[PDB]
Each structure stands twice: as structure tokens, then as C-alpha cells.
Amino acid sequence: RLPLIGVTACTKQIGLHPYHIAGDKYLRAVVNGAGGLPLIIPALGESIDQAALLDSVDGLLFTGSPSNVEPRHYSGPASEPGTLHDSDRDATTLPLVRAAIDAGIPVLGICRGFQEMNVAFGGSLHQKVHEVGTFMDHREPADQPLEVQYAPRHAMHVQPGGVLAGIGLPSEFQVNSIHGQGVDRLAPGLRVEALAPDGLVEAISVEGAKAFALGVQWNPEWQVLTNPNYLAIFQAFGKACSKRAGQR
Amino acid sequence: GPLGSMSRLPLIGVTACTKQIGLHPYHIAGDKYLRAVVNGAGGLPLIIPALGESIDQAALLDSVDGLLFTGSPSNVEPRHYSGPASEPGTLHDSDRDATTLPLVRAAIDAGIPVLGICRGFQEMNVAFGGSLHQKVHEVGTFMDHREPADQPLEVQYAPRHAMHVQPGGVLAGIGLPSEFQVNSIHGQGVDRLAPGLRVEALAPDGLVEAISVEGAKAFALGVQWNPEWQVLTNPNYLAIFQAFGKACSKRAGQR
Ligand SMILES: [Mg+2]
Ligand SMILES: [Mg+2]
Known part of the structure; x- marks a missing residue:
């Protein structure tokens, strides 16, 4: 039976x-790269029974988003006014990450979803990576079309002995970068699964998780079937x- | 849920639209x-993306306990019922049509309860071989079913015309009164x-505004109005969602 893979929604007026x-x-990356049947998980928080939700899915994709995790979830400084947030999503995904990993449900986090994985387990974020002083500007270039914004823009250094090494990714490869926030x-x-050249942590796995649990800061759904490094991640997730x- | 109940919670699929x-x-x-599924039907909603038959709809349906075909500002493309070309500027969503018209039929053949609202009611009619009027207000004896777009949501989604239940069907069977008022946020309708x-109910101008699938093995109801709007405060809207939820x-x- 094909796996039913939940895909996190954002909220939008x-x-x-x-x-x-x-x-x-x-959604298309889930179909074409992971071999799954995608269903979208609304951002309803614990308004609904997350244990019943987890029982019906075979995996979860925590997607990227223009929005940012609210800093109160890591006791961070208040965000600059006008920072895009989605508290309904935060209320859904942070408990869902923890519950899925405890239940042995495969998890892939992309960009915001990778940030959610770090925050859910007690980590913090830089809200303006480009201003810390130690890091490159990881945001996509404004005033450029999508094909440029989502093209590979910086290197990625795989740390040995983990999930990315096990999947067979090269020790260094290029990734896109569409993010103003990052792991603090x-x-x-x-x-730590991978580092950008400035030392920013851009991929993680969960130690001792019973099942696949990987997050990456880049956006491997982008033209996935045509980027072997991105496709390998989705294929590994799909196999999990x-x-x-x-086992049903 | 009801006090002391241990019944399995139903997973209810909710149709997506596409949008840039x-x-x-x-x-x-x-x-x-989504909130009406939770509060009115007692289910756990998951959204079904408009991926058409690029995925295995039968295998998707095996994992859901019901389907809500939502309303939308968009309109079914008239090719599906051999209708006249739409006026230029008419909003369509062909990816949605490619998903919902086959999904309606597959769901009813599999005994998956179906509730269609507004566009979803129209989809039910088209999927079984019916047709639509693309501009009801230009046709026959029909009146203007469209919402006043210069007004706040509270006015747009309030009840604006009567609804006359036809005896002997689903709506009478769930105990709806013979006549009640409904909202009206639609410019297309059943031809x-x-x-x-x-026919489950008629507007005062004769427009068919509710249908059920005779011979369906499971619940299969569509209504032209929008009963998800503040579903708990309207007993007639709530009765519809409760009947759907029970199915x-x-x-x-059975899982
Ligand atoms: Mg980056
Ligand atoms: Mg009407």
C-alpha cells in the first residue's frame, strides 16, 4: 500500500x-520523489486529536514557509514588528514533531520545518542570520525571478556518520538558500548532518529516533526530480x- | 464528542482549490x-489536494471516512456538461474539476459519505450527468442568488432567501422543517x-438547491447554500453536518 504522507499547511488570509x-x-515532491499520497494537515493546533492524526499517516513533511516561528517558543527576543508569523501553524507543528518522532512516524523537515524541528526539541533560532556577523546572507535575492531565487547558491558540507552520509550524498554539494532565520x-x-561554509547548521537528525527523522534548511522540493541530491532525500524519506x- | 463515547473519530477529507x-x-x-467538520460533524479534517488522477484516488479513499466537497468562488468548466462557453473573465479551477468530478463518483461507489456545499453540490450534479446555468439570474424564472459583494461577511453569509424542503428525502428524514431561510453565495445553479x-429542496424561484443520490450505499447529500457558516448557531445547518458526521x-x- 502506498504511504499516506501528511503535509503541513500554513494559514493565510x-x-x-x-x-x-x-x-x-x-505536494508534487511527495508524489514524485517520495512515492506517497499527500494529504494536507490543517493548522488547527491541538483543537483536534493529534494521536488519531498520527495513527492515520505513514510519514510527515513539515514544509517551508515565508513565515517564522515565534521566538517565545525558544525564550528568544521579541521579533521586529512586521515579522511574518503563523501562530496557528506553530501550535500545530511543534507538538506534532515531538509526537511523531516518539511514535516512530517518519519526519522530513524543509526550511521552516527544519527550524521547527530544532525549536521543538529545545533549540533556538537566529531571526536575522545575515546580521549575526559570522554568517553569509542566506536569503534569496530580491528582485530576481523564482528560477534564480531557488537555484543553488552556496555549498553544503556533509558531516560523516549520519543520515545524509548513509543516503550516499557527496561530501560537499550545492544547495539553494531561501531563509532569513537559522539555527542559533x-x-x-x-x-549535525551538514554545515554551510560559514558554519551555519543546515541539516539535523534526531538521535535515537526509532524512525527516519531528518531536517534540512534548504528547499529540496524545488525541481526535485532533476536534482539528484534533492531527490535522494525525498527517496530516502519515501522508503521510510x-x-x-x-507494517499496517 | 458525546459524554462517555469511545467511537473512533472519523477522518474527513476536505477538497482543496488551487490558487496562485x-x-x-x-x-x-x-x-x-475545516472548523465545521470539527465542530459540526465531529471529524478530523484533512485537505485533499487538487492533484487529479495523478494519484490513486481509490487508495486515497480507502483512508478517509467521509468527503466534504467545499464551496468556492470558482466555477465548473462548462465542457463537462456540454454547456456554452463561459463569459470571458469567469473564474475556473480546472485542476479542481479534474480532481472532484471523478472523486465524487469513486466515493459514492465505495460507500464514502459525501457532503457537497455550493460548488460541491454543483459538482455532484455534473458528475452524475446533469448540467448548470452559468448565470442563474439571466435564466427562466430564477432570481438573484448572488451575495452582495460590497457588504461585510456577516451580511454576505446571512440568510437571504427561503428554502422549501421536498418531502420523503434526506432533509425531511433528519427532521428539518418544511421551510427555513438559507444564505445564498452563488451565481450558478442546476439546469x-x-x-x-x-430533489431535496427548492428555492422560492424553483431553483433546485439540494439533492441526494438515490441508491447510494452511503450518505450522499449536496446543498447549494453554505451551511458551514457559523454552523453551531443555525439548527438547520448543524443538522446537516451532524447527519454527515454520523455517517x-x-x-x-468498520476499520
Ligand atoms: Mg542557506
Ligand atoms: Mg440560493
């Missing part, structure tokens, strides 16, 4: 109405989801 | 539909009623 939204490129303090119990699906 | 937002294509669903569909719970009990 569209005209007069509130919506729950999920990007097509994530690494949560306890997380393994299929293993869970096959 | 900022630089990217998205699949979207209105919060009011040819699909074969095998029961979804019956299927969940």
Missing part, C-alpha cells in the same frame, strides 16, 4: 476569508514511509 | 469548512438535474 494552504511544489543554539539530542505503511 | 499566492501555486481550503438524483462515524467503526 485571502480577501475576507481565512485559509489553510500548502504549496504545490511540496542546537537542541540537545540532535545530530513505505516501511511504516507496510 | 505571491510567487507560487498553492492548494487551499477555507478555515470555516438539467442528473438522473438518479432526488462518517459509521464508516470509521
Whole structure:
């Protein structure tokens, strides 16, 4: 049976109405890269039974987003006014990350979802990576089209002995970079999977997780079938989801 | 849920629309539909992306206990019922059509409870061989069912015309009164009623505004109005969502 893979929604006001939204490129990556059947998880927080939710899925994709985790979740400084937040999503995903990993449900986090994984286990974020002084500007260039904004823009150094090494990624490869926030303090119990050239942690796995649990700061859903390094990540996630699906 | 109940919670799929937002294509669903599934039907909503038959709809349906076909500002493309070309500027969502029209039929053949609202009611009619009027207000004896777009949501989604229940069907069976007022946020409507569909209710101008699928093995109801709007405060809207939820719970009990 094909794995049912949950995909986290964002919230968005569209005209007069509130919506729950999920990007097509994530959904198509789940179908084409992971071999799964995607269903979108609305950002309803613990308004609903997350244990019943987890029972019905074979894996979870925590997507990227223009929005940012609220800093209160890591006791960080208040955000600059106008920073984009999605408290409904935060209320959904931070407990969901912890619960899924405890249940042995495969997890892949992309960009915001990677940041969610670090915060959910007690880590913190830099809200303006480009201003810390130690890091490059990891944001996508404004005033450029999508194909430029999502193209590879910096190197990625795989740390040996973990998930990315096990999947067979090269020791250094290029990744896109569409993020203003990033890991500050690494949560306890997380393994560093990869570093950008300025030392920014851009991939993590969860030590002692019973099942696949990987987050990456870049956006590997982008034209996934045509980037072998991105496709390998989705294929590895899909195989984990299929293993869970096959134990039903 | 009810005090002391241990019944399995139904997983209810909710249809997405497609929309470009900022630089990217998205699949979207209105919060009011999702909250009505939780509060009115007692289910756990998951959104079904508008991926058409690029995925295995039968395998998707195996994992859900019910389906809500939502309303939308967009309109079914008229090719699906051999209709006249739409006026230029008409909003369509062809990726949604490619998902929902086959999904309606597959769901009913699999015994998955179906509730269609507004566009979803129209989809039910088209999927079984009926047709639509693209501008109801220009046709026959029909009146203007469209919402006043210069007004706040509270006015737009308040009850604006009567609804006359036709005896002997689902709506009478769940105990709705013979006449009640409904909201009206639609410019299209039923023209040819699909074969095998029961007329459940009529607007005062004769427009068919509710149908049920005769011979369906499970709950299969569509309504042209928008009962998800403040569903708990309107007893007629709530009765519809409760009946849907009970059917979804019956299927969940079979897992
Ligand atoms: Mg980067
Ligand atoms: Mg009407």
C-alpha cells in the first residue's frame, strides 16, 4: 500500500476569508520523489486529536514557509514588528514533531520545518542570520525571478556518520538558500548532518529516533526530480514511509 | 464528542482549490469548512489536494471516512456538461474539476459519505450527468442568488432567501422543517438535474438547491447554500453536518 504522507499547511488570509494552504511544489515532491499520497494537515493546533492524526499517516513533511516561528517558543527576543508569523501553524507543528518522532512516524523537515524541528526539541533560532556577523546572507535575492531565487547558491558540507552520509550524498554539494532565520543554539539530542561554509547548521537528525527523522534548511522540493541530491532525500524519506505503511 | 463515547473519530477529507499566492501555486481550503467538520460533524479534517488522477484516488479513499466537497468562488468548466462557453473573465479551477468530478463518483461507489456545499453540490450534479446555468439570474424564472459583494461577511453569509424542503428525502428524514431561510453565495445553479438524483429542496424561484443520490450505499447529500457558516448557531445547518458526521462515524467503526 502506498504511504499516506501528511503535509503541513500554513494559514493565510485571502480577501475576507481565512485559509489553510500548502504549496504545490511540496505536494508534487511527495508524489514524485517520495512515492506517497499527500494529504494536507490543517493548522488547527491541538483543537483536534493529534494521536488519531498520527495513527492515520505513514510519514510527515513539515514544509517551508515565508513565515517564522515565534521566538517565545525558544525564550528568544521579541521579533521586529512586521515579522511574518503563523501562530496557528506553530501550535500545530511543534507538538506534532515531538509526537511523531516518539511514535516512530517518519519526519522530513524543509526550511521552516527544519527550524521547527530544532525549536521543538529545545533549540533556538537566529531571526536575522545575515546580521549575526559570522554568517553569509542566506536569503534569496530580491528582485530576481523564482528560477534564480531557488537555484543553488552556496555549498553544503556533509558531516560523516549520519543520515545524509548513509543516503550516499557527496561530501560537499550545492544547495539553494531561501531563509532569513537559522539555527542559533542546537537542541540537545540532535545530530549535525551538514554545515554551510560559514558554519551555519543546515541539516539535523534526531538521535535515537526509532524512525527516519531528518531536517534540512534548504528547499529540496524545488525541481526535485532533476536534482539528484534533492531527490535522494525525498527517496530516502519515501522508503521510510513505505516501511511504516507496510507494517499496517 | 458525546459524554462517555469511545467511537473512533472519523477522518474527513476536505477538497482543496488551487490558487496562485505571491510567487507560487498553492492548494487551499477555507478555515470555516475545516472548523465545521470539527465542530459540526465531529471529524478530523484533512485537505485533499487538487492533484487529479495523478494519484490513486481509490487508495486515497480507502483512508478517509467521509468527503466534504467545499464551496468556492470558482466555477465548473462548462465542457463537462456540454454547456456554452463561459463569459470571458469567469473564474475556473480546472485542476479542481479534474480532481472532484471523478472523486465524487469513486466515493459514492465505495460507500464514502459525501457532503457537497455550493460548488460541491454543483459538482455532484455534473458528475452524475446533469448540467448548470452559468448565470442563474439571466435564466427562466430564477432570481438573484448572488451575495452582495460590497457588504461585510456577516451580511454576505446571512440568510437571504427561503428554502422549501421536498418531502420523503434526506432533509425531511433528519427532521428539518418544511421551510427555513438559507444564505445564498452563488451565481450558478442546476439546469438539467442528473438522473438518479432526488430533489431535496427548492428555492422560492424553483431553483433546485439540494439533492441526494438515490441508491447510494452511503450518505450522499449536496446543498447549494453554505451551511458551514457559523454552523453551531443555525439548527438547520448543524443538522446537516451532524447527519454527515454520523455517517462518517459509521464508516470509521468498520476499520
Ligand atoms: Mg542557506
Ligand atoms: Mg440560493
